[PDB]
Amino acid sequence: QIGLAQTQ
């Protein structure tokens, strides 16, 4: 489970 991810 991942709620929110922001990746760069």
Side-chain angles (χ1 to χ4, degrees):
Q1 294 170 325
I2 297 160
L4 188 150
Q6 186 178 258
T7 72
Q8 188 191 54

